[PDB]
Design a protein around this ligand. Structure first.
Ligand code: KR5
Ligand code: ZN
Length: 257
């Protein structure tokens, strides 16, 4: 099965998922000089005040913080989006070292990690139908750099020892994802894909320019997670990021000058 190893990593995915070599794959490098400011882009509207987290899961590739998406609660709208998108889960991608881990890059700069807040377009009724549509998902991407701790991340960090290995989950209620948001909502946007199999070309990417800082200790705890299941040889969950993919016939737009 696919993963983040030397024999099943990103360069192999196209054999089972040949959309891997498609026209709108993610992530990409954001060349900041050639992204154009688009004055028609709107401010991003992030409304997380009623978000209801339920559970955190080690799925063997990352951990997902899952949300109850059965009511109109935690929604993303505005920005480049038409309509409204409901938060279903967030997760991260990170490195074995501070100098790598992000999926998107900025003028080739790799950040230590990247947070993905995943939302589905309500007009398609559920996530599984949304991923079949070219405007089905909106993923809010936020870079992480190592410096001062992020207080709003610590609750996630401290539950990780309970979900060390693949297939483990833990209750995770009352987590407020507003505590993971940078001060500024300036962003870049482009049409792309899921960054893990099935690599479906269903995402409007919204990547914030301002990173959040987390401490070394916080990322170090991400790096103690395991890709393996309990009772199997330990494989640390590190370097769970896909490299930048060809931009092809796409424009990256900036919300800001
Ligand atoms: C029920 C159902 C049906 C499909 C195709 N699912 C996923 O694709 C699961 C993977 N979802 C996913 C993958 C990558 C990303 S990312 N890394 O591009 O944000 C976000 C969500 N789930
Ligand atoms: Zn992701």
């Amino acid at each position: 099965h696919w993963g983040y190893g030397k024999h099943n990593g990103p360069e192999h995915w196209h054999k089972d998922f040949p959309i891997a070599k498609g026209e709108r794959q993610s992530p990409v490098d954001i060349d900041t000089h050639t992204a154009k400011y688009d004055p028609s882009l709107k401010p991003l509207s992030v409304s997380y005040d009623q978000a209801t987290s339920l559970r955190i899961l080690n799925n063997g590739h990352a951990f997902n913080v899952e949300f109850d998406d059965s009511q109109d609660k935690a929604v993303l709208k505005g920005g480049p989006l038409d309509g409204t998108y409901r938060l279903i889960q967030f997760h991260f991608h990170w490195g074995s070292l501070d100098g790598q881990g992000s999926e998107h890059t900025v003028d080739k700069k790799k950040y230590a990690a990247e947070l993905h807040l995943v939302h589905w377009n309500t007009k398609y009724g559920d996530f599984g139908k949304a991923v079949q549509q070219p405007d089905g998902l909106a993923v809010l991407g936020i870079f992480l750099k190592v410096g001062s701790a992020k207080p709003g991340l610590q609750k996630v960090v401290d539950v990780l020892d309970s979900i060390k290995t693949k297939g483990k989950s833990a209750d995770f209620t009352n987590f407020d994802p507003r505590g993971l948001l940078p001060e500024s909502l300036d962003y870049w946007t482009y049409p792309g894909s899921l960054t893990t199999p099935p690599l479906l070309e269903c995402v409007t990417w919204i990547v914030l320019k301002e990173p959040i800082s987390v401490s070394s200790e916080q990322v170090l705890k991400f790096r103690k997670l395991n890709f393996n299941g309990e009772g199997e040889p330990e494989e640390l969950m590190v370097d769970n990021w896909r490299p930048a993919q060809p931009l092809k016939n796409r424009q990256i737009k900036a919300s800001f000058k």
